[PDB]
Amino acid sequence: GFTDYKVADITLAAWGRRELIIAESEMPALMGLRRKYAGQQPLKGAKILGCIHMTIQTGVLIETLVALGAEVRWSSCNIFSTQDQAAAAIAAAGIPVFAWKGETEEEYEWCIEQTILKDGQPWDANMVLDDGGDLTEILHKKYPQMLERIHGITEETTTGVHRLLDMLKNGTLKVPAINVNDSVTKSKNDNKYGCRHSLNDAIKRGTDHLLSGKQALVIGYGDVGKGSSQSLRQEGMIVKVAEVDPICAMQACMDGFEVVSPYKNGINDGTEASIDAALLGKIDLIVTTTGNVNVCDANMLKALKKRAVVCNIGHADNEIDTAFMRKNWAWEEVKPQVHKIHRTGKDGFDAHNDDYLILLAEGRLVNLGNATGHPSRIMDGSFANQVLAQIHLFEQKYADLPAAEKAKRLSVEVLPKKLDEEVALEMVKGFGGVVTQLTPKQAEYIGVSVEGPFKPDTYRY
Amino acid sequence: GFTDYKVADITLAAWGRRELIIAESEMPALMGLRRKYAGQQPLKGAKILGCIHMTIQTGVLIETLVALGAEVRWSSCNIFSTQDQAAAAIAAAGIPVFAWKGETEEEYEWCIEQTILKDGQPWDANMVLDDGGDLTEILHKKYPQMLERIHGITEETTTGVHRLLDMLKNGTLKVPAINVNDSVTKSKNDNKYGCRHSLNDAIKRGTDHLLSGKQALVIGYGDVGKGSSQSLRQEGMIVKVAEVDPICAMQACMDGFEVVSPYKNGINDGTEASIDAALLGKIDLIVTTTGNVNVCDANMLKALKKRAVVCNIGHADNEIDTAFMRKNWAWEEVKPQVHKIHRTGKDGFDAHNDDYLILLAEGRLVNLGNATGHPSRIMDGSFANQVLAQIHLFEQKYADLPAAEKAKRLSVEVLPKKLDEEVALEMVKGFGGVVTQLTPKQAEYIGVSVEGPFKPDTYRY
Amino acid sequence: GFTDYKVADITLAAWGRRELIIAESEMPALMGLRRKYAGQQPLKGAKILGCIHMTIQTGVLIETLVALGAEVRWSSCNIFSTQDQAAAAIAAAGIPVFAWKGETEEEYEWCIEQTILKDGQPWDANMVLDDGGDLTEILHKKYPQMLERIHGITEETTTGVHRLLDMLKNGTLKVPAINVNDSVTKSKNDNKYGCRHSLNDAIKRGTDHLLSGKQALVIGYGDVGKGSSQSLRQEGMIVKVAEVDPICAMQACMDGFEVVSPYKNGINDGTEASIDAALLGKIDLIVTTTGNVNVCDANMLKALKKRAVVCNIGHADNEIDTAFMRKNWAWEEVKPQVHKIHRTGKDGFDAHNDDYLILLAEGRLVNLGNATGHPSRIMDGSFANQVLAQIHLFEQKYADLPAAEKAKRLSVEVLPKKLDEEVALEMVKGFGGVVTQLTPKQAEYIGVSVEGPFKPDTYRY
Amino acid sequence: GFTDYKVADITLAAWGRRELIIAESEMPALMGLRRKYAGQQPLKGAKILGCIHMTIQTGVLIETLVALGAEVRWSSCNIFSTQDQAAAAIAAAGIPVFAWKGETEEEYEWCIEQTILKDGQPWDANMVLDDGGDLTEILHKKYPQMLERIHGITEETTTGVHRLLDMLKNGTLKVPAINVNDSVTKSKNDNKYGCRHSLNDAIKRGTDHLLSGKQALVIGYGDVGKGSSQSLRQEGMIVKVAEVDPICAMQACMDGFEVVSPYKNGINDGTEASIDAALLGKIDLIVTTTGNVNVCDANMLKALKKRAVVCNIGHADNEIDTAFMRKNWAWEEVKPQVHKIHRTGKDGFDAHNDDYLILLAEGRLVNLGNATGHPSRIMDGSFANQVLAQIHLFEQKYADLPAAEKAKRLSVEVLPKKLDEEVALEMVKGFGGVVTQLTPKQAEYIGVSVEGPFKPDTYRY
Numbered sequence A, B, C, D: 001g002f003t004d005y006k007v008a009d010i011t012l013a014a015w016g017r018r019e020l021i022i023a024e025s026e027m028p029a030l031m032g033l034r035r036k037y038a039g040q041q042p043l044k045g046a047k048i049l050g051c052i053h054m055t056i057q058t059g060v061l062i063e064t065l066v067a068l069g070a071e072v073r074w075s076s077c078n079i080f081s082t083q084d085q086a087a088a089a090i091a092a093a094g095i096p097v098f099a100w101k102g103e104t105e106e107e108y109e110w111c112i113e114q115t116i117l118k119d120g121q122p123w124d125a126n127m128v129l130d131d132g133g134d135l136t137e138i139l140h141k142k143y144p145q146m147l148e149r150i151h152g153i154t155e156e157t158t159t160g161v162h163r164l165l166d167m168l169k170n171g172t173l174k175v176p177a178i179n180v181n182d183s184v185t186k187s188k189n190d191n192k193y194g195c196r197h198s199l200n201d202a203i204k205r206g207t208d209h210l211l212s213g214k215q216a217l218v219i220g221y222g223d224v225g226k227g228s229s230q231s232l233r234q235e236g237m238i239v240k241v242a243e244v245d246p247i248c249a250m251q252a253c254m255d256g257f258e259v260v261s262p263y264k265n266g267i268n269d270g271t272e273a274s275i276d277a278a279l280l281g282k283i284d285l286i287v288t289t290t291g292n293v294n295v296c297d298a299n300m301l302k303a304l305k306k307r308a309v310v311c312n313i314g315h316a317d318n319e320i321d322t323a324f325m326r327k328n329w330a331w332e333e334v335k336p337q338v339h340k341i342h343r344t345g346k347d348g349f350d351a352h353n354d355d356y357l358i359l360l361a362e363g364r365l366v367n368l369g370n371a372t373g374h375p376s377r378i379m380d381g382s383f384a385n386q387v388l389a390q391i392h393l394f395e396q397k398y399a400d401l402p403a404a405e406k407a408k409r410l411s412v413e414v415l416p417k418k419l420d421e422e423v424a425l426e427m428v429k430g431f432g433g434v435v436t437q438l439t440p441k442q443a444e445y446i447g448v449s450v451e452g453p454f455k456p457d458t459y460r461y
């Protein structure tokens, strides 16, 4: 009967299910929600448009939403991030999913449109779960009538939240959102420790390069740059860090990294003469982590050491100037999501040319494109937050509020600290960790409840 | 003919001056402010009561405040934290200071009273710089009339800020304060990296013990606990972490520590039966980092491995139950701020007894008691913030405001992010770090100024 | 019209060749030998039986031997270690190779036989290059007449060398050997840093498990155990180490590991009562590194935590008692080289059973089975030694010596320190490292030549 | 009425004894020998000339030698290494010791002469325990009749052993020696992990500098350089390494250090033009670890960054060219064993001069000069070996052998591996480590006894 899906190969379903059964055992916060809320069915009647990397971890999120009563229609938010066995297992469970590894851009857009439309007409969606804001943008621009009946958006990523806050400032956001990224059990777990796990993993899978003893430049030292720099330093790389934010740069210095700029004195004068050629001529590996544009620009790429690896773990495909490389230099596929870019010109190359760079995942998320992204026990935190955020906005029923009541609730908000702590506690117990209970005297002394929350909203962890 | 001081030994002044000249070269943010504001004299007319560890680093702070036009009267906020050469150098410069290493509690109170009183009468103070809140409490309880002429308090430490926020919530705070602690260039520099540097330093100076291969228990995993755990792990200790806050415990797990409780199932019901005797019987070193009371309690001390080291880098002398040890067990001074505590009874000890613990700094701040606290290049951040906070509150002139205007400004506030970034930039340049300048295109892409600030006020770093 | 090979898929040749061209740029010592000796053709007339993991790195070794004039016939020394693209590239270059990933044991023996036989008769072999000693053993037991014409064996691995030294002690060794393992640029490069790179790589590829915060037990702390312990600790695992050698255990303690035994008091009396069930009940990962038998025995496997991962990076398939698991417990293939072993019985399992272990590479070398083994820039050292050792024994022409002269040369020897240093220098230059030249006065002061060797033969590095 | 000593202050004895009693609890291998051999008095009649750093650790060694029946006469082998409380405690126990912190060179020679002479005439010495070979050299050159009656020398340090091997090769060594340094429980414990503990300790005590984020250059990567590099990297320094030995350089690369030379292309032709001014102009700290001469030369000192710290943890005072600095530049004592060296000229300096270096311990061993050297639990290994070596040579009674029998025993040898393992085992047990016992089957499989030794003499650990 069930045909409402499109995946690479449905015969991978049994493999996907074996990996989902393992992943459940690695996701105690998400499986804890599944057990706590099963009887109450808090997402009964929820119809969720989901756009996030169709991994095994996203599989456990989907099956938790469904176990709590939701229906979903799913796509990946990246052309290389799907695990074909995860997409097959979800299709085989009778869930609409449109995702495969190695989509074209045209197929990416088609997949999102297959979630929005059921049998050629808008689905009766009433919730959105987004990673990076592409689905959110398409609904606002192309399907405004659908947003009338949507109660909320839950957004995974730093870049997606930035796009929501821009819409809210400009008065174009039509439904409330939860900023899932800024839970501590997301931002200071997934963004940092996920990249610590998955960056060196992706570089090894793609290149099998020794990292020990080699020179890296990490562009950015936010949550992703911090985790990326550690991924590489812990392998024995000599890591230098670039930053525009002097507070983040101060953290890099204290963490034991040299803070450098690709530009002389940190100033881009619009010419190749402002590039620190001596510095870039020694770098074996550049990683972009910024959420910004052209932080590894054409003139940097021209100055890099021969056979340097270039990758992006931040956003989109334009942290590195891949457009410059597509226009000017010859691409030689080594294997999927690994290209040698020959700096000898556009029209062919010598197979034994020494003057190339290695680009991973065509300048798109390297951890998800060349490996499997973050591990289950880290994504547990992010995805437990996603479930709690879906429950919160679905129960508030914004779409059913009268105009005057909507105006008061139209916001981009974080989950309460108490929920962030309850997710953290399930993660700690998954490690076999034992938190201490405050005595009444101690709770009084520091001015908190024995139940928490334990820190004021200003606390930075 | 200057006599308005009390220090251990004025003949240490020349040594103090030599170390102050080195410290100036290690404190570019603080010396940057000294050079930028010297001509403007923004603290002309300021009369500052200062109570903070009389170290070489505090010496550079005092001489910066004086260089910007202030008069000060100074004491230490801890009986063991004074560096006698720093106190001597400050006295020799004609600045009133009442501080020596190894004060009694009675001498500590006398020293604070000597700052408050000049020639037997209240000094015409109009500013307060505090670390831990003891001076703040004495002014509110004993000298309320003096607070009528005081424009503000600048408070250094987590515990001091907690005490200010309690006064504000109870309506007993009489003057506005700046929370210096919660500048990122304080809390996420000093509290973390300071303890990283100075905890293993103090344990080595006191005991000369090998740390590698030994078992530690760090109680707390806030900023101080994070830095403390790293101090020990980086030396090759096997570190276990205790926490009441599940988010901080999650961080400890992800950072590669086992999270344990001294109590079975984390429940302290006050009985010896609740103590995890198997765990505590393997611990060679306990460090308290909490700012809470009785987190290393009598029953834990009884269960500790023979010859374990016990120390506190958080607050006061009651994180460890030192009162229990003073009443019940015999103390053998090894050398100043190092005592063997013989668990054989309160009266006689055998010089060759094997059943003892080693207590550092009598359960008071170990980094400052057994070594020299944080290094100059870290305290640069904290003390640049102190100077900016003093300038801000002095210029606001709260004490001269009409009643209606006072009411609107009576708060506990942090410095603006822009100043936090300007401190960080001077610290980065001290390392020879080069921040990148955003292009206008990049600044517009992430919605910030090329000049910063670079992050929203919610950002946690 | 070359057909003298058997590989998984000859159409993988182009991909293999792209990866060989990258590997050449990562192997400066091996490519330095290729360039230095090309003109001399020192292996002209050498006919080498090779048995070592048919990886990209082994590909560069093979083509170096051929570039120096050798003919070879090749097989893999492990049923899971072949990279099918590497085997294809070598076949497509017209080199006899019999190797694929996922051989049966019967296919493994048939592949070695295809190297020994050409067109149904013993090949006119005159050199052996071995890893683990299986080919060496087959020649001695089954083809002793072939050894009459063989000039020597060059042996890669600790276990293979141990087997050669046993043959020499028993007087059963028929040709001289070089112990390649005990070059410092092999043992203290490959064995240690190779495993550091490739152990966490293999565990991530097989399971995608988070390692940070979890408990590991590494059995052994020789070169492989040291590198393995670091692989895990650098990811944030809490690593405990087992050893029988108290000197290696001393090193583990000092390196910051707790040293534990699976057995109470370290005494394995073969009973379940001797197992430390509390210790094994907390372990998430066991790694064997010993080259010994039954160091993760049936009683340990029964006591392990549910869903623990078990793997071997040492030798054979019997460091872990895989025979006990094949007899007693049901194996569920997750994907190739990843099995769940259900401790509920032999005859099938509940798909949702929680009581299983995860076995990687069926208890055989996990780095080569679940990933790609050591990276090119590490194997450069091992394989430069292999080439120098082949040249040395081929030039000595043992098989052509009179009986009296044979007797004096029948030994298992290491390469001279001077060659070890010349390999190391090419590796250092590959990192862009610059070695200092001694002045004549300095060389005289420490009693060495400016050219080296720099250390006496007793030096341990 | 014991007066046969010279120390700084006999009233420090009680403090010394308290620290000796603690040190006993940290030295289980040395205290194990004291307990095992007490009844047998193996050193009854031994009269030992001892020249080694008069630390608390040396005190426990001395009192073990005395407890086993020896008489000794002691001096320090370094002018800054004595702990005055240790020297006092040894004098107060009625043991001849001539040692204080801050000897002149003339006092150093006088102290050694006070051990050799008792009441103005040669002591009836029959054993030597030396560190660095100065006492050994004096006996050979000045007191050859005394060597007739001496049974052996036990030598602590790499440099001392090199001097013994030179005497043996030249036929000038008069008595046999044990090379204590090359026990694995010395060289790969003390030399490496001792410096790891004590290098950052000494730099903090001397300067209180932040190390995190600053640039270091470690000259040498033998056991001392390895431990020194780790001391600094673990604190967050960015460490570069220099070497002449390409094998040691390879290890530095793999351990995650950049390998550089102070000289362009590593060629030290004695010209200023050969200095890499750009490299040295960024270095905040140079540490020499070589046992060689002029490895931090005048032209390097001229090129160093302003306010760089320079120190030596290797040997003598001429690894750094201190003689050049004494001749050309003005020394300003900060405090004992800390000098600012003003590069503005020889005579006066400006108190606020920015152009200086900081020299620790006047270029002599920094760990012992500015802190307390290695900790008790590490020196346990070195000193257990010293005691075994004294017992071995004393029992052999070389001086009582006839000329022809002396000739066969005149050697420089190491202790047998079995004793090295027995020292290691006591050290492991002191950490609470549990070694596994081999089964009979396992011991047979790897060809060792269940009792050990576990490795061949060629094994490098």
Ligand SMILES: NC(=O)c1ccc[n+]([C@@H]2O[C@H](COP(=O)([O-])OP(=O)(O)OC[C@H]3O[C@@H](n4cnc5c(N)ncnc54)[C@H](O)[C@@H]3O)[C@@H](O)[C@H]2O)c1
Pocket (backbone or CB within 6 Å): A157, A158, A159, A160, A190, A191, A194, A195, A219, A220, A221, A222, A223, A224, A225, A242, A243, A244, A245, A248, A289, A290, A291, A292, A295, A313, A314, A315, A365, A366, A367, A368, A373, A374, B436, B438, B442, B454
């Ligand atoms: N790949 C993944 O699995 C993964 C996980 C989490 C988030 N992300 C994405 O990674 C990006 C970074 O996320 P984050 O949470 O670290 O954001 P963040 O704001 O915490 O960090 C980004 C940092 O980049 C710095 N930066 C900006 N422009 C720069 C420039 N030109 N040069 C140097 N530094 C520059 C900023 O100062 C900032 O500190 C976002 O796009 C986010 O969505 C990816």
Ligand SMILES: NC(=O)c1ccc[n+]([C@@H]2O[C@H](COP(=O)([O-])OP(=O)(O)OC[C@H]3O[C@@H](n4cnc5c(N)ncnc54)[C@H](O)[C@@H]3O)[C@@H](O)[C@H]2O)c1
Pocket (backbone or CB within 6 Å): A436, A438, A442, A454, B157, B158, B159, B160, B190, B191, B194, B195, B219, B220, B221, B222, B223, B224, B225, B242, B243, B244, B245, B248, B289, B290, B291, B292, B295, B313, B314, B315, B365, B366, B367, B368, B373, B374
């Ligand atoms: N010694 C120094 O140089 C230095 C430096 C900075 C701050 N401090 C002091 O250190 C203390 C901690 O400061 P912080 O900035 O880390 O505060 P914080 O609030 O960041 O961290 C304190 C941590 O203690 C934990 N905690 C509380 N009670 C506990 C208990 N019973 N068991 C386990 N964990 C418990 C809390 O959950 C919290 O995470 C304060 O008193 C502060 O003033 C000292």
Ligand SMILES: NC(=O)c1ccc[n+]([C@@H]2O[C@H](COP(=O)([O-])OP(=O)(O)OC[C@H]3O[C@@H](n4cnc5c(N)ncnc54)[C@H](O)[C@@H]3O)[C@@H](O)[C@H]2O)c1
Pocket (backbone or CB within 6 Å): C157, C158, C159, C160, C190, C191, C194, C219, C220, C221, C222, C223, C224, C225, C242, C243, C244, C245, C248, C289, C290, C291, C292, C295, C313, C314, C315, C365, C366, C367, C368, C373, C374, D436, D438, D442, D454
């Ligand atoms: N997978 C790879 O890529 C790779 C690389 C190098 C070598 N190897 C193999 O790894 C194995 C180990 O090699 P190595 O060079 O480390 O040898 P090694 O002799 O240096 O180390 C082996 C260690 O195992 C210890 N050991 C033995 N039995 C033990 C037991 N019952 N419990 C605990 N510890 C025990 C020994 O004391 C020794 O220290 C060998 O089989 C070698 O051929 C594998």
Ligand SMILES: NC(=O)c1ccc[n+]([C@@H]2O[C@H](COP(=O)([O-])OP(=O)(O)OC[C@H]3O[C@@H](n4cnc5c(N)ncnc54)[C@H](O)[C@@H]3O)[C@@H](O)[C@H]2O)c1
Pocket (backbone or CB within 6 Å): C436, C438, C442, C454, D157, D158, D159, D160, D190, D191, D194, D195, D219, D220, D221, D222, D223, D224, D225, D242, D243, D244, D245, D248, D289, D290, D291, D292, D295, D313, D314, D315, D365, D366, D367, D368, D373, D374
């Ligand atoms: N301070 C202490 O507590 C302590 C402890 C042990 C030994 N030592 C002394 O430290 C010194 C080193 O001992 P070790 O055991 O490390 O010796 P080692 O032989 O293992 O190491 C010395 C290293 O210096 C390198 N080297 C020599 N000249 C060099 C140069 N010009 N540039 C760069 N590298 C150069 C050599 O190649 C060698 O690797 C000796 O003098 C030893 O006696 C001191």
Ligand SMILES: Nc1ncnc2c1ncn2[C@@H]1O[C@H](CO)[C@@H](O)[C@H]1O
Pocket (backbone or CB within 6 Å): D052, D053, D055, D056, D057, D058, D077, D131, D132, D156, D157, D158, D190, D194, D368, D372, D373, D374, D375, D379, D382
């Ligand atoms: N605390 C200490 N006491 C005695 N000797 C020491 C100490 N620290 C280091 N040493 C020795 O100093 C020697 C160098 O002179 C080293 O070989 C080491 O064994």
Ligand SMILES: [Cl-]
Pocket (backbone or CB within 6 Å): B439, B440, B441, B442
């Ligand atoms: Cl622009």
Ligand SMILES: [K+]
Pocket (backbone or CB within 6 Å): A055, A057, A372, A373, A374, A375, A376, C208
């Ligand atoms: K994953």
Ligand SMILES: [K+]
Pocket (backbone or CB within 6 Å): B055, B057, B372, B373, B374, B375, B376, D208
């Ligand atoms: K300090």
Ligand SMILES: [K+]
Pocket (backbone or CB within 6 Å): A208, C055, C057, C372, C373, C374, C375, C376
């Ligand atoms: K490989």
Ligand SMILES: [K+]
Pocket (backbone or CB within 6 Å): B208, D055, D057, D372, D373, D374, D375, D376
């Ligand atoms: K010491």
